């Protein structure tokens with residue numbers, strides 16, 4: 290009853306943290322920028338982890354008996370939240386890049402309306418992908434609970450070929466390679482800006498200060514996505530071993546737990562990274578708690 294205790298502890302924080310982040314945004318209009326529209330998507334997405342994903346994860350750990358639909362949803366629901374975060378993280382990276390690369394067209398292209406539109410699409414795509422095993426790509430009854438109901442065990446009811454090729458390599462690895470690629474251009478060009486402003490016949494500390502702050506946001510964004518791959522790779526890394534190497538010692542249950550748990554942890558690091566990285570955020574939360 291320790292994995293249960295720890296998982297619960299996480300659930301509370303995930304809820305409190307991101308809910309706080311959502312509230313802070315709702316109160317402080319200085320945080321209601323087009324950029325943070327995606328941050329809320331991250332909040333809602335990661336809140337539901339402690340809300341549902343964690344509850345389900347803890348449940349499916351022991352396994353139960355239910356129909357294929359009901360069993361798949363519970364097993365693949367986590368994929369939706371994890372996939373939605375991908376789009377959010379990617380969008381943010383794009384956003385932070387757009388501003389630095391094209392500050393003038395930033396306001397013309399980055400619209401508070403398009404933000405809401407993209408977010409919606411990301412979620413729709415997240416469900417399609419995250420719940421693709423429900424489209425038929427599953428192992429429900431592949432060579433107890435009785436007819437109709439199936440032993441709901443993640444590894445037994447969810448195809449590995451999907452979790453490796455379609456899910457990881459494509460829906461996770463590729464984006465992370467795109468995101469990382471984006472930040473590459475972000476900082477490379479950002480420092481170029483400073484060099485051009487380094488050879489300017491005028492002070493113009495307004496441009497520098499702004500640029501540095503834009504970079505500070507882009508850097509924070511990088512740290513947010515960085516912690517994502519860092520908390521999910523081990524899990525996929527484990528599965529990559531199990532699949533590509535049937536011979537390779539199948540990951541122990543205890544080690545699998547840790548890797549599984551680490552993924553749930555990511556939802557929590559955000560609220561604290563905002564309070565730490567963003568001086569505007571910390572002061573907002575400080576207000577809420579006190580009052």
Ligand SMILES: Cc1cc(-c2nnc(N)nc2-c2ccccc2)cc(C)n1
Nearest residue numbers: 346367443444524525528549550552553
């Ligand atoms: C309930 C649950 C199950 C698993 C999980 N379990 N077994 C295998 N073989 N793969 C994954 C897995 C790996 C990468 C991405 C998503 C799931 C992970 C988490 C965090 N929660």
